[PDB]
């Protein structure tokens, strides 16, 4: 009949007080559909509370075909209002081994391109390096090699070809069906651009010790006012730290002084004189063996 919000309010005011936790067969199936009605209604809080109940119960229960596949779709759909690509990347760790073992490679290939999309948009964390090697990675797939090289590109990426790579190949990014964010093109050129700046600026400190602010704007594709916005977020979140000189337009590394000179930097000189006497002393006999014969 065309009713959406009315159908959701009926089920939410009944099933909560209906089941007494007796029969878990039809109970779990309807809760998965109960959160779907909240998605069409637009309330993410109703589905968030229900997502913390049967998630731990299903984990202890054995795996099923139609039941386990519903959790993978709902956790992606609830990210519309959340707009956090880091949380969904952890939810897709289960489907990664599910479609590669229980299912075939037919449905595993599109899931492979989806799980790597949430990894590129991950702002930070050490789980990014663990998801590079994985298990089934290097499947000789066209969409996999493009996304896998993109993760390792962030080290050497100068953001010169960044708009060219996304325009030439756009499997998961500009043109996509599942896990497609933004109205059309606008959120794809924003969220993805904000992440690649964070990954690029992180290694600049490890490479450029002193860089001109005028040159820094060209590498990050920003301006004087836009550059100070992204670098201030990484320092506030505890990512990296650098020098920003507004009048002189000089961006340095600003090495920390907690080393206290002799107390730190000089302690690295032990292996300098440790490999001298110990090595040559071992090669005294070898010199007489080669020349003696």
């Amino acid at each position: 009949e065309g009713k959406i919000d009315e159908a959701a309010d009926i089920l939410c005011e009944l099933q909560v007080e209906t089941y007494g936790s007796m029969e878990m067969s039809e109970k779990i199936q309807f809760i998965l559909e109960q959160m779907e009605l909240s998605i069409l209604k637009g309330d993410y809080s109703q589905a968030t509370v229900l997502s913390r109940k049967i998630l731990k119960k299903t984990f202890k229960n054995p795996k099923y075909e139609s039941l386990k596949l519903e959790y993978y779709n709902l956790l992606v759909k609830i990210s519309l209002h959340k707009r956090e690509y880091l949380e969904v990347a952890q939810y897709l760790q289960e489907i990664y081994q599910t479609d590669a073992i229980k299912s075939d490679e037919a449905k595993w290939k599109p899931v492979l391109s989806h799980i790597v999309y949430f990894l590129v948009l991950s702002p930070y964390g050490n789980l990014q390096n663990d998801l590079i090697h994985k298990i089934q990675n290097d499947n000789n797939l066209k969409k996999l090699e493009s996304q896998e090289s993109l993760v390792k590109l962030f080290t050497t990426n100068e953001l010169m070809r960044w708009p060219i790579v996304q325009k030439t190949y756009e499997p998961v990014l500009n043109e996509d069906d599942l896990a497609f964010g933004g109205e059309a093109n606008k959120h794809h050129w924003e969220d993805l651009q904000k992440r690649v700046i964070e990954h690029n600026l992180r290694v600049i400190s490890e490479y450029y010790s002193r860089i001109t602010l005028l040159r820094l704007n060209e590498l990050l594709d920003l301006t004087e006012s836009q550059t100070e916005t992204y670098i201030s977020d990484l320092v506030n979140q505890g990512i990296i730290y650098a020098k920003v000189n507004r009048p002189a337009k000089i961006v340095n590394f600003e090495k920390p002084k907690n080393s206290s000179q002799l107390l730190n930097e000089w302690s690295h000189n032990v292996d300098e004189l440790l490999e001298h006497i110990e090595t040559i002393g071992h090669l005294i006999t070898k010199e007489e063996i080669m020349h003696g014969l």
Binding site: E228, S232, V235, N236, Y241, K243, V244, R246, E254
Partner: protein
């Protein structure tokens, strides 16, 4: 007695247990009918909103004004001033903090306990704005600092040097 005890928590902070004194008092003066006036009942409502802002809880401030059980239909110029301060703390800006200062100055600056916490909240939101400036590297032009703070050059240099 609960109101006077809560006043000692103004300078000594500790607003967690101080809310029980102002909450139980609001229901006490509401049942006095003729024995209590309208101004004395609105000041108690101002003390509850002022105590939660010092405790830095956004959701509890909105629950006092929106819910009719907590509000009991009491509103004035000074009561709405606490809503602007709560909105100024969410965005962390001094523009909305001084916006309600000029229009509500009659009731807002009339109470001494509110004016005593005015300079406290003035520096509270000012220090929070400095944490965004101080976190990155220093040696930035003062002219660009006043644009982030939102005050005059002489006012920003005067308050920053005080801390």
């Amino acid at each position: 007695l609960d109101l006077m005890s809560g006043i000692l928590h103004c300078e000594d902070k500790d607003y967690k247990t101080a809310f029980s004194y102002f909450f139980e008092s609001f229901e006490s003066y509401h049942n006095l009918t003729t024995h209590n006036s309208y101004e004395k009942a609105c000041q108690v409502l101002k003390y509850m909103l002022l105590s939660k802002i010092m405790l830095n809880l956004i959701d509890d401030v909105k629950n006092i004004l929106n819910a009719k059980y907590t509000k009991e239909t009491y509103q004035s110029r000074g009561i709405d001033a606490m809503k602007a301060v709560a909105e100024a703390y969410n965005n962390r800006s001094l523009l909305d903090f001084n916006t309600a200062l000029k229009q509500y100055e009659k009731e807002l600056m009339g109470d001494e306990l509110t004016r005593s916490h005015f300079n406290a909240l003035y520096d509270t939101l000012l220090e929070s704005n400095l944490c965004k400036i101080i976190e990155p590297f220093e040696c930035v032009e003062i002219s660009h600092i006043s644009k982030i703070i939102g005050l005059d050059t002489q006012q920003v240099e005067g308050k920053l040097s005080q801390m």
